[PDB]
Design a protein around this ligand. Sequence first.
Ligand SMILES: COC[C@H](C)NC(=O)c1nn(C)c2ccccc12
Ligand SMILES: [Zn+2]
Length: 140
Amino acid sequence: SGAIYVGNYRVVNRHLATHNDWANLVWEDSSRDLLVSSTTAQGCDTIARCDCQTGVYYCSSRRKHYPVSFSKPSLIFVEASEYYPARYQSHLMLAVGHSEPGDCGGILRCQHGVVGIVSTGGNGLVGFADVRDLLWLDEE
Ligand SMILES: COC[C@H](C)NC(=O)c1nn(C)c2ccccc12
Ligand SMILES: [Zn+2]
């Protein structure tokens, strides 16, 4: 589990969104595994606006933050899960790192801010849904 709280927005993995999230929807994209909802209180996270390929992510299955090198956001084939069939997921970045299904939502961050959240993984790999291209997350 995990969310990014920037301004009046809550960014969660679309497959983990609650009834309250759907009842206060701002934007969702199934192919990116992202959903954004509105919040009443202001968030303290800051979105990275950069082209970084190194950062640090939170792994709840180890209660540790790990330094990682990750690929550029792309269209990657992802195996079937309980939440999606086997399909291509867009805006996905891969890294070598420990992950388990419940690690979804952990933040990946660089020196510029929050880069994205854990979305995919398995066999010593961890994948992150990028949020750096979503410039609207900074205003209104
Ligand atoms: C976009 O896919 C949504 C689903 C719920 N995600 C996964 O299956 C999944 N996510 N992580 C971090 C894993 C690690 C190990 C095995 C599976 C996974
Ligand atoms: Zn950066």
